[PDB]
Design a protein around this ligand. Structure first.
Ligand code: MG
Ligand code: MG
Ligand code: MG
Ligand code: MG
Ligand code: MG
Ligand code: MG
Ligand code: MG
Ligand code: MG
Ligand code: MG
Ligand code: MG
Ligand code: MG
Ligand code: MG
Ligand code: MG
Ligand code: MG
Ligand code: MG
Ligand code: MG
Ligand code: MG
Ligand code: MG
Ligand code: MG
Ligand code: MG
Ligand code: MG
Ligand code: MG
Ligand code: MG
Ligand code: MG
Ligand code: MG
Ligand code: MG
Ligand code: MG
Ligand code: MG
Ligand code: MG
Ligand code: MG
Ligand code: MG
Ligand code: MG
Ligand code: MG
Ligand code: MG
Ligand code: MG
Ligand code: MG
Ligand code: MG
Ligand code: MG
Ligand code: MG
Ligand code: MG
Ligand code: MG
Ligand code: MG
Ligand code: MG
Lengths: 169, 211, 122, 296, 159
RNA sequence: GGUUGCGGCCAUAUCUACCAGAAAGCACCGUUUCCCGUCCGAUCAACUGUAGUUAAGCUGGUAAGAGCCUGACCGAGUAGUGUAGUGGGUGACCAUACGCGAAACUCAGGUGCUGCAAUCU
RNA sequence: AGAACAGAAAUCUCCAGUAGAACAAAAGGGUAAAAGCCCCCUUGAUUUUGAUUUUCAGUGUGAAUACAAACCAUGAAAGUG
RNA sequence: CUCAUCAGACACCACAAAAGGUGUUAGUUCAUCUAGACAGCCGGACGGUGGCCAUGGAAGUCGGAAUCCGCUAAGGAGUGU
RNA sequence: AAAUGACCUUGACCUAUUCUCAAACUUUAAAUAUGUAAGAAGUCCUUGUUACUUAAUUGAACGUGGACAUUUGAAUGAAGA
């Protein structure tokens, strides 16, 4: 019974996990920035492994959060890459979904061999209206069962839009 | 090297377990506490005979093991491997210390030396369950195990059904009409409390209000 | 005061005195605390002289205020020196004294058997 | 409720519930302690808070003192009282906050008796100032500003209500660096800007910024402002004349009888379900044991 | 060696009244204290400033001073064969108005009440407390109360 | 009686699953010129009260629901304990006498009460 | 439970989460719009002499508490130091 | 109640244990018995029937599954040769 | 052939059960011990002082005048304190 139980997208966050710091990272970041228009945020390493050749607080990734119409736009610009086909995996039982794409030139943006090529994780987190209870300061509350995103409910929303296909099993 | 058990017969100290603090403890000489057909069903063995302590004393893990093997052996060799369930109801969690003899009695707090169980009066030590066709046999087994222990213990026949807290008539009443539900060693019972749907999937045979 | 007697049960023997026991106690061993100097009673003029304010002016006036626990029992009683009894004459009737009366001893509240004992000690 | 998630008996037995008004995300007790508690040698003289809250577009301004049995309202003024004094639309603007501020300022000053004395600042040039105490006579009424869970940004309307109670006469100790037109870097304040915000200048300037580059959202936003033929040039006097109206009569009269309370009690106990009898649910489960275990 | 610090041995003493941890409710900052009030002393483990030394836990004293955040309490501590006067500066969080006199006060107002009501009619005052007197005669009926005769019971085992 | 702002006691108020909610109020909700804050007007700031909705918040109800609170000659005068004896017993330990007296268990009942101000078919 | 390389371990997201973490250090207390984590502004780790608590002889010392009189820091503020 | 070919004989106290006795004493739970039980001499245990597989060869009996009628006071498809 | 494959297997984890424990574990929680109070230095009223404190003769502390006597506020004891 939806009078407004109408499944918007909350945010899309793009993520290059550039597994070390320096030039390659300050390049993946400008990639995120001429795809986002926003200044992206760098992520420091939590701890230190030395298999993956990293050090605590090493600035070894970058991501960016884009919300609303621009994020529908770059979502579609990536479902093109993945041919509007997804998996019955790839979906949180909590309602969101994501995919990944190496070869970040399949998104539009041209090649420019003084930045290289990069892959990207796409994560689309979804929510109905009145997600504000959970995220506001005063009276912070939890949304009723009936009203929050489901996996099944969001694969149905995803198939219904984009005429896309999800998976086996 | 093991000291004679008379040196630790009595509960002179407060419980000294293995712990963060004591923590160099040697291993208990008794490690298996259920013997025989321990997988059997509560219906399989309605008779129950206890070996019960009549003293406030301490029983060495060494003599616990010694008398476990004593009694289980006699019982199988005259009854069969799966004729009885023998449960020892006493775990020896109390660590005995010893002062290892150019010094004197300066600074003379011992190292761990053994383990031992601290048994009250009337505390069950052994519990054995069979069907009444056996009773003489398990009785004689516990009687032979008695001789492995310091201090008077007495064998007594339970009024209860095997290892249940129910006497035989009350247990019959419960299961004949609606309420017992086997489980691997043991059994579950029908509550009148809690979820009514989740109470019905479980124990469907009942609520005929009949056998 | 009952909690007091509980506190001292193993050192005393006590019970419920009859009129006869109280009368013979005051007559034979009844002494007043008068500006101490405990004083044998020996004439009602002494009682009147000190318990007079309270309406007690005889030895039987005294006894009666004791036995019918009086509006002035506190003063009537604090006026009598503690009675100095001899040992029981018959004996104690038990082989050992420092057990409860109930256990064949002597201490605690025997209840009317206080009268046999005190009469044997007075 | 994923099977992997449900809570144990033990979890709940050993769980310590917070204070109701904290479960309800409504009271910052760490703040309440320090607002309410008084100097112990001041013994019964209560600490008065000027609470101001914001419903979704309506402004509350109470003056409360606290009490072991429950906070007691000395004066109350709601911004929806502004019709009375000559404002009609947007009673959540900065100047509606200032208005309500002033309103309760003078409502309480008169409820007390420092009505004639401590008339506050009248010629409101938007200056920074506090209602000073008067030589040889009663000190002003003192209240502290209870902004609740509001997030103290420079230039926000909680401090507008602040500015208006202050300008009305209440002594409400306050700095200036969160008044609109406080300069981020250089530590000074623009009073022409603060007077503007006191009056409307940012809303009026929005109006005549939209009346000639978007008639297509000016259409709907500001609808009432056209439906009553009043544009930007206006407001500053709507508000100045409300100010007059309030300083002239603060007296709070309330709303007309209108189905007095027992009537409401009835027509809402129509919608208030009352609990079931133990015998009721006894039978309501004996029904279910017949109907479900009973082989249909 | 040994350890005798200021809060030594207070492990449970200062513990937090299980499922009552957290911030202190505001009624204990809303209570008022005047010089000469009788107060109890219980430490609140969550307010480390101004707390009483363990010796004064469970102890009752009299207010002698009133300051901004705290009260001064007078306590009589027994050192040797004599009491000395000790003056603790305790925060309001560790103090509690005492009901050790509530009986007394209620019984002085009750006393003056029935004393007025006494000299109203003829004076029959009767207003000192007296200990429990012993019971008085009574008649017990057997109507529908005939006595069930009990005997002791033989040895069972039950186990 | 509902509701809101501020509350006192801080689960009889919490948790889980459903269902109901008139009026008003809260709410979600629309916008980005201005003050203000962000990687993101999501939060935070401001503007509108206009364009929209009871879906959620919130209120209430249902459940041999979990938890929680209360009560009882339920267990139990049990365990423990103050006091006594030239009591029993090789000892371990034990019974008795004058008092105090639990916890678990079991069963029954209950699921917020209430202060100030304003507002409501 | 979910996202290219990515693997048990890299970075991103949501859900649950009474503290099962963290607060230099030993341990025990204590703490959830904090006492923990990120940020902003600072020097109250300052000045003057008294009283008080523990240890106690009611000496000293160490440590601590609550005020008085200053001058300051922070915050819209109550406050807090 | 106890008879000791090392009896025992009074708190603290000047020691004795596990375990055993068909010495004797009292008691507990099962049983049999004047419809004759226990003990001891005496008779009877036959038969429907060698009921069956091992068959070098088992009426009950080296041995292995097995399990009952007729007569009767009773008499095992078999306790021991 | 592999499978993010079905299947057994032993493992650890989850669920409801089960035997047994703690000086340095605990929701609960005694007994014995332990702090304070049981009036005249009491209770109540009327309304002065101040530089502290209040929005405020508001409060706070200390006072003037007035009303209620030994059932004047439990017990027991007191060769007195
Ligand atoms: Mg709707
Ligand atoms: Mg690498
Ligand atoms: Mg001992
Ligand atoms: Mg020892
Ligand atoms: Mg040695
Ligand atoms: Mg030497
Ligand atoms: Mg040493
Ligand atoms: Mg050592
Ligand atoms: Mg125990
Ligand atoms: Mg033995
Ligand atoms: Mg059990
Ligand atoms: Mg003689
Ligand atoms: Mg004679
Ligand atoms: Mg003798
Ligand atoms: Mg004589
Ligand atoms: Mg459970
Ligand atoms: Mg705050
Ligand atoms: Mg030590
Ligand atoms: Mg908490
Ligand atoms: Mg400190
Ligand atoms: Mg509506
Ligand atoms: Mg906002
Ligand atoms: Mg609904
Ligand atoms: Mg709400
Ligand atoms: Mg509810
Ligand atoms: Mg329930
Ligand atoms: Mg005892
Ligand atoms: Mg003894
Ligand atoms: Mg620590
Ligand atoms: Mg320093
Ligand atoms: Mg010392
Ligand atoms: Mg000295
Ligand atoms: Mg010296
Ligand atoms: Mg010093
Ligand atoms: Mg011999
Ligand atoms: Mg003895
Ligand atoms: Mg023997
Ligand atoms: Mg034959
Ligand atoms: Mg303990
Ligand atoms: Mg005492
Ligand atoms: Mg007295
Ligand atoms: Mg006297
Ligand atoms: Mg004298």
């Amino acid at each position: 019974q939806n009078p407004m139980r109408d499944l918007k997208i909350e945010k899309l966050v793009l993520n290059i996990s550039v597994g070390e710091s320096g030039d390659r990272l300050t390049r993946a970041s400008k990639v995120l920035e001429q795809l986002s228009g926003q200044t992206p945020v760098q992520s420091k390493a939590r701890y230190t492994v030395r298999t993956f050749g990293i050090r605590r607080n090493e600035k070894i990734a970058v991501h960016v959060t884009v919300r609303g119409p621009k994020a529908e736009e770059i979502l579609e610009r990536g479902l093109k890459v993945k041919e509007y086909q997804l998996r019955d995996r790839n979906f949180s039982a909590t309602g969101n979904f994501g995919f990944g794409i190496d070869e970040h030139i399949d998104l539009g943006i041209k090649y420019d061999p003084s930045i290289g090529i990069f892959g990207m994780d796409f994560y689309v987190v979804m929510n109905r209206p009145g997600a504000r209870v959970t995220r506001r300061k005063r009276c912070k509350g939890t949304v009723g069962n009936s009203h929050k995103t489901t996996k099944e409910d969001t694969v149905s929303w995803f198939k219904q839009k984009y005429d896309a296909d999800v998976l086996d099993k | 090297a093991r000291r004679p058990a008379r040196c630790y017969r009595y509960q002179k100290n407060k419980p000294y377990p293995k712990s963060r603090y004591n923590r160099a403890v040697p291993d208990s000489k008794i490690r298996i506490y259920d013997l025989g057909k321990k997988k059997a069903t509560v219906d399989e063995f309605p008779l129950c005979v206890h070996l019960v302590s009549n003293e406030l004393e301490q029983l060495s893990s060494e003599a616990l093991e010694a008398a476990r093997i004593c009694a289980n052996k006699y019982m199988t060799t005259v009854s069969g491997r799966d004729a009885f369930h023998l449960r020892v109801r006493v775990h020896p969690f109390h660590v005995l210390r010893i002062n290892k003899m150019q010094q004197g009695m300066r600074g003379a707090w011992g190292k761990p030396h053994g383990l031992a169980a601290r048994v009250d009066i009337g505390q069950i030590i052994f519990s054995v369950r069979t069907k009444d066709s056996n009773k003489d046999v398990v009785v004689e087994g516990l009687r032979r195990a008695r001789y492995k222990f310091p201090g008077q213990q007495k064998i007594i026949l339970s009024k209860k059904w095997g290892f249940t807290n129910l006497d035989r008539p009350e247990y019959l009443k419960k299961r004949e009409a609606g309420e017992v539900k086997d489980d691997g060693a043991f059994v579950k019972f029908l509550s009148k409390k809690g979820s009514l749907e989740n109470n019905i999937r479980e124990f469907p045979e009942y609520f005929a209000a009949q056998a | 005061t009952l909690e007091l007697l509980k506190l001292i049960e193993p050192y005393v023997a006590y019970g419920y005195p009859s009129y006869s026991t109280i009368r013979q106690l005051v007559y034979k061993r009844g002494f007043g605390k008068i500006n101490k100097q405990r004083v044998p009673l020996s004439d009602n003029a002494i009682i009147e002289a000190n318990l007079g304010k309270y309406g007690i002016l005889s030895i039987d006036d005294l006894i009666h205020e004791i036995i019918t626990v009086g509006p002035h029992f506190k003063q009537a009683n604090n006026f009598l020196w503690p009675f100095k009894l001899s040992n029981p004459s018959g004996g104690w009737g038990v082989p050992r004294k420092f057990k409860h009366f109930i256990q064949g001893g002597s201490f605690g509240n025997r209840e009317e058997f206080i009268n046999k004992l005190v009469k044997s000690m007075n | 409720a994923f099977q992997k998630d449900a809570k144990s008996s033990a979890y709940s037995s050993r769980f310590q519930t917070p204070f109701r008004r904290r479960r309800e995300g409504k009271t910052d007790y760490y703040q309440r302690k320090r607002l309410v508690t008084q100097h112990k040698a001041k013994y019964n003289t209560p600490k008065y808070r000027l609470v101001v809250r914001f419903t979704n577009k309506d402004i509350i301004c109470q003056i409360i003192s606290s009490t072991i049995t429950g906070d007691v309202v000395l004066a109350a003024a709601y911004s929806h009282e502004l019709p009375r004094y000559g404002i009609t639309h947007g009673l959540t603007n900065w100047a509606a906050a200032y208005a309500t501020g002033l309103l309760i300022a003078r409502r309480t000053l008169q409820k007390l008796g420092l009505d004639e004395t401590y008339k506050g600042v009248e010629e409101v040039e938007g200056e920074y100032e506090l209602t000073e105490a008067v030589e040889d006579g009663p000190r002003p009424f003192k209240v502290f500003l209870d902004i609740g869970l509001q997030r103290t940004t420079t230039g926000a309307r909680v401090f507008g209500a602040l500015k208006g109670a202050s300008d009305g006469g209440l002594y409400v100790p306050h700095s200036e660096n969160r008044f609109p037109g406080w300069d981020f870097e250089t530590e000074e304040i623009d009073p022409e800007l603060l007077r503007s915000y006191i009056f409307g200048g940012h809303v009026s300037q929005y109006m005549e910024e939209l009346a000639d580059d978007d008639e297509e959202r000016f259409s709907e936003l500001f609808k009432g402002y056209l439906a009553d033929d009043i544009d930007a040039d206006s407001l500053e006097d709507i508000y100045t004349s409300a100010h007059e109206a309030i300083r002239a009569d603060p007296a709070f009269k309330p709303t007309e009888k209108k189905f007095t309370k027992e009537q409401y009690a009835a027509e809402s106990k129509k919608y208030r379900q009352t609990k079931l009898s133990k015998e009721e649910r006894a039978a309501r489960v004996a029904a279910k044991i017949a109907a479900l275990a009973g082989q249909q | 060696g040994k350890s005798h610090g200021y809060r030594s041995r207070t492990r449970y003493m200062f513990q937090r009244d299980f499922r009552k941890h957290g911030a202190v409710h505001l009624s204990t900052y809303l209570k008022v204290y005047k010089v000469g009030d009788i107060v109890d002393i219980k430490a609140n483990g969550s307010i480390q400033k101004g707390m009483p030394h363990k010796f004064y836990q469970g102890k009752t004293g009299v207010v002698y001073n009133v300051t901004k955040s705290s009260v001064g309490v007078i306590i009589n501590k027994m050192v040797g064969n004599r009491y000395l006067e000790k003056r603790l500066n305790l925060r309001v969080e560790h103090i509690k108005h005492s009901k050790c006199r509530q009986e007394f006060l209620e019984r002085v107002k009750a006393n003056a009440a029935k004393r007025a009501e006494a000299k109203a009619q003829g004076v029959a005052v009767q207003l000192k407390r007296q200990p429990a007197q012993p019971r008085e005669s009574r008649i017990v009926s057997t109507e529908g109360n005939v006595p069930q005769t009990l005997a002791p019971v033989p040895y069972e085992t039950f186990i």
